[PDB]
Amino acid sequence: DAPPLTLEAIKDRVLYVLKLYDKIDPEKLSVNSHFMKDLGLDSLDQVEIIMAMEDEFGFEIPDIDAEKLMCPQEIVDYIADKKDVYE
Amino acid sequence: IRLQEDPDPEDENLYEKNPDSHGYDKDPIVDLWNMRVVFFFGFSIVLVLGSTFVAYLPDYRMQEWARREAERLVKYREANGLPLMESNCFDPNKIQLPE
Amino acid sequence: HVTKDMFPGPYPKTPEERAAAAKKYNMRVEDYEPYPDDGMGYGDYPKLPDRS
Amino acid sequence: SFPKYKPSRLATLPATLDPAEYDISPETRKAQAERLAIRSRLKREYLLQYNDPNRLGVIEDPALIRWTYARSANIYPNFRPTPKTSLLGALFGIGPLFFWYYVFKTDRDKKEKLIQEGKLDQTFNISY
Amino acid sequence: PDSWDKDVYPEPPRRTPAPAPQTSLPNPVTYLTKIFDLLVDRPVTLAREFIEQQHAKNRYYYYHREFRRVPDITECEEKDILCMFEAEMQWRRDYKVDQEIVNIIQERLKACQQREGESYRQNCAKELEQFTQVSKAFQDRYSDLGAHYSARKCLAKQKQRMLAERKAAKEAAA
Amino acid sequence: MLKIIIPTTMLLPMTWMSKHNMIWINATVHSLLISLISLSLLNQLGENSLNFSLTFFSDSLSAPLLVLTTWLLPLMLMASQSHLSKETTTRKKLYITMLILLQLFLIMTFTATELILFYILFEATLVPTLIIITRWGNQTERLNAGLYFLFYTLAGSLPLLVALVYIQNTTGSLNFLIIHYWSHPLSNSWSNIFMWLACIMAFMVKMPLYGLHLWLPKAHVEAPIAGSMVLAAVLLKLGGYGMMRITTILNPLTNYMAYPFLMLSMWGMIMTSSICLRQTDLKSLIAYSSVSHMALVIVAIMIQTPWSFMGATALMIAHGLTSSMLFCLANTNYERVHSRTMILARGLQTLLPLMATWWLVASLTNLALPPSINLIGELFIITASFSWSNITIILMGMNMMITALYSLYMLITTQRGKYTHHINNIKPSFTRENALMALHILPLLLLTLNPKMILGPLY
Amino acid sequence: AFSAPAAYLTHQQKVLRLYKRALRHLESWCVHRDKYRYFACLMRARFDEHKNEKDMVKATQLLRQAEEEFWYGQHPQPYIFPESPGGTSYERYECYKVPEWCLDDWHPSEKAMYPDYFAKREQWKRLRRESWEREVKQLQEETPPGGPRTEALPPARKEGDLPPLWWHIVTRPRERPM
Amino acid sequence: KRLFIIKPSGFYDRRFLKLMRFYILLTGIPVAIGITLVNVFIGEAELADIPEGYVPEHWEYFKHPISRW
């Protein structure tokens, strides 16, 4: 019924959420932008980003895996792997 | 070790050597005919023929006979004003009480 | 492949028996604790926390 | 400040409210590491067997075998007729029998006495 | 069909009020009844006519078996196995006939209650009294004789009841 | 009855002279033919039994049991085909010979007209069952199971032999017709109490009765599939048939001696259902369910009312069929995974749909779903017990609730859930197994359609 | 679920999990988005106020008090995502998940109904059977003499190898198998 | 895109179902046809009083033609 997800759509949506975040400069934001190394965030900000992704995609990321997603590309890979997206 | 014992053999799968196996025998023809005789005899003969035989068994329990006799007795009793069911099974004249 | 020494046995009395029982059940010796010897037939089976 | 949560048998204490979860000694860390090591060893053995391509059957579980053996075939050899076991067995095996015997005997005696006195409504009772 | 005895199975005369419509609207029940008669009743009537014509081609009869009367357990001597057997068989046949009589009376009662409908508590009180009498007599005869009931046990029960009645009558008029 | 007896004694030489690869086919075909022949015994009279000769007679209680035995033999043959693939020809022929001898002894036991011949055959059934269990069982406990079974039965039945010979000396004959027509009341004295105890205790140990029942789980768990099928379906009904036959001469003392056994049977229903609630073995669950149903039959026989005997007979037949089907399903699951633990294999509805359907139907029949003959018998027994007293309704209600609970519990545990990941030898169900389940289940529904054939002689 | 657990949770992990739980329960209480944003900002203000604390004993005491406050003030019926454990759609499709070992029990006619799929399946089976020895050798080379200390598996060091114990992870059933 | 649906082998269960249906209908259909033909062309016996000085048989005491046979 619902249209299937794709890698490009997942990347677009996660970058959309990150660009809507007010503590991230959209011009310096890319899929390889580390949240703490080159974006200057901290643990609480990373937790809030993970929660925003959970709200965006309508599913919960366990805390054991959420503490390791430090890149938009990593978030995309996790979502695609969980949703069984291969294209 | 304590004995010169054979190792436990692996269980054989009937579907490996015969994908059309019915599970009766490892020989294909014997398996097929075992299945055929079991199905034919059991299902067809026993089920269908025994079921219709039991359904059309004669009324040796005399249920319909008892119903007809009851109808006749009820008609005779209520036609003559007699009670439908008697007070006693036996005759007090023939019964002699001890006294 | 299970041997005769891998089955539950009597209540462990000496500390060596307790260590052997803990090793049998793949538990730490400190974490191992059997049921009290009230004659209820539990044996040396560990008394794990009553959670679900 | 806030009302305290009181744990019970069926309402066990949560892990975040356990006082021992905040008083950690260096020995506790060693115990946790040992537990993790045991779990990892068991997991490695199971995963090797599970991912073996030539395996065809059921991976026998010694823990399951021990549980089934202890619950069924290991009870009597480890039974001693202590006073507790004697009293519990006598109670739970005899008391219900005499209780039901007394109840049914009283009920049937009352019914029989009523029948003998001829004050029990037995009309339309032709199926017993 | 009416292949049963009206006296054995009584039925009060059927009074159906005549249709007296007070409106100009057509009757859907009447139209559907006409449709049902045209589509179902006529074909099933034709099929039954054909089947009954085929049955009348070869007509054969079956009979109701008549059983002779034999001396009963009261006349049977003690330890006389043949007479006891005959009396027991006769008693069992009588028991089955009495059971079917009770069934007939119960069927009468059920039919009368359903027929009367909303005024059953008064209209079908004649069947209730007949059922009460039949049930009382049946209970007094074949009361709790057990699963191993026999003509001898029924005779013993009757003798006990007769003795009790005689003692009550004596203590009343004595 | 010779027209049924002789074909079994011809099954024996046919089995021993048939070819090595035709033994199963010949045995199954001719067992089915013998069952069809034995179907003619259902044409019973309404007043007296069918007296073929001075030795054998058939009644409305004997006929359904004979039909059940003759129908159960080929199913046991199919199960034996299942689990005896690698056996030698001589040992397979010996197994078939044991089954045939057991069936012949059961037929003669059900059709015997005298109590002493009935006892002789009813004790003769012990030898083939003991041999089958202790020879073709799979685990170590088969020897202990055989010892328990044999000694429970014999300790029960020897005082029965003493009582029978005493009764013959006192009265003149042990012929059932004579002891029924010439029956006299039993006085309330110690000697009569002990004679009653001898007979009843023999049949209750055979039944079994709660407290005298450990041999039943021991033997049924450790027996092979055919042994379990014959132990649960027919051999348990020897006690009920004997009690329904022997109670003719025990009145009115039965009205006074029935209290301990009634209380034992009802509390045993409750206790065995509760045990079924927490069993880690499937065969043990089925065995304890059998114990509960037989306790209900005991209650019916002891209260001894015309509405209780019909329920007793119907429940015996229904329980025999249902227990045989349950044991067959459990044996299929065991042969797939080589373990009797219930929680070992799950997701069997995902892996095997048709077997899930068979499990659903068997569990529905076990919990007495209307209008099945299981429910018919249970409801008749409950109504008779209610007439007896008005707290038996409470006991029966709680027993029925727990029965439904454990039946659906075993169904959900075995069939529903997530399949075990490391069990990758679940092959598709065989046509033989599917046909076995169908042949178990269809007669139950046909008897539901026509229930007057299994309601005993008091119908 | 994809990550091997550690022996224990550090203080940072404990406080982060408490923060996420508190935010989720606050969202459950504050249904509307603006109200939730206001109170989530207040909650993060509290966390940032307590963020800088050199005294670990005091930090642990604050964490314990915060956990007690959360347990007292938690939502009795918190929002749960449908597919998450405890959700209304949790484990809904577990009955539709069938494995490839079931898939290889098919009849030849059924297999012939899908000719192209089973060629690739045979290729996958050969690939699995040609790597097991290398996988077990790599696993036994890298383990300490005592045994594994964690549930983390090594990757494939060589170019022609595959990460050990990969078959079931790769061939697990799809989240919507039917 | 169409994805392969992994299912357990239903061929054997379907084959068993078709075999059971065939073997039940192998003789069930002739039995039903025979019963219908007997009921249509050979109706049930009609109850009649026993003729004077006549001794019938048991099948003459039964009604349905199949039961009499």
Ligand SMILES: CCCCCCCCCCCCCCCCCC(=O)OC[C@H](COP(=O)([O-])OCC[N+](C)(C)C)OC(=O)CCCCCCCCCCCCCCCCC
């Ligand atoms: C299954 C194995 C069976 C083995 C033994 C088979 C023995 C067959 C013996 C020959 C058949 C005799 C039938 C009765 C002949 C008519 C006269 C009579 O006595 O009628 C009595 C009674 C009543 O007869 P009546 O004497 O009242 O008069 C009727 C009117 N006339 C005189 C014209 C006959 O019944 C009938 O007449 C109806 C008979 C119906 C027969 C069909 C229904 C049963 C079907 C059974 C199928 C099973 C296989 C059968 C194979 C053989 C078929 C023929």
Ligand SMILES: CCCCCCCCCCCCCCCCC[C@@H](O)O[C@H](CO[C@H](O)CCCCCCCCCCCCCCC)COP(=O)(O)OCC[N+](C)(C)C
């Ligand atoms: C489709 C879904 C099925 C499952 C759900 C069930 C839903 C209801 C389905 C109902 C289907 C049947 C309805 C139509 C029934 C027609 C047949 C029926 O009317 O006849 C029955 C008869 O059926 C048979 O008697 C059943 C036979 C049962 C015995 C079979 C034994 C086979 C051998 C197996 C041995 C097993 C041993 C077990 C211990 C004995 C009832 O007897 P009766 O109506 O009056 O006979 C009429 C003939 N008269 C008039 C001359 C008397």
Ligand SMILES: CCCCCCCC/C=C\CCCCCCCC(=O)O[C@H](COC(=O)CCCCCCC/C=C/CCCCCCCC)COP(=O)(O)OCCN
């Ligand atoms: C006044 C209102 C009563 C309401 C009843 C409520 C239920 C309470 C009754 C049952 C509770 C259990 C009591 C019986 C069980 C024995 C208790 C026990 O096990 O004690 C033993 C030691 O044995 C004793 O202490 C015995 C004391 C109690 C004896 C009671 C009198 C004995 C009764 C004799 C009759 C026995 C047969 C009864 C049935 C006969 C047929 C009716 C050791 O206990 P531990 O668990 O190790 O330590 C725990 C400390 N809290």
Ligand SMILES: *P(=O)(O)OCC(C)(C)[C@H](O)C(=O)NCCC(=O)NCCSC(=O)CCCCCCCCCCCCC
């Ligand atoms: P990030 O990696 O940048 O690092 C941040 C952390 C917090 C890990 C710090 O590095 C750190 O450890 N700092 C010192 C330790 C510390 O801050 N301890 C105290 C923090 S917990 C605390 O203060 C929580 C109190 C307020 C929240 C209480 C929750 C109760 C509300 C429940 C409501 C539920 C329903 C509404």
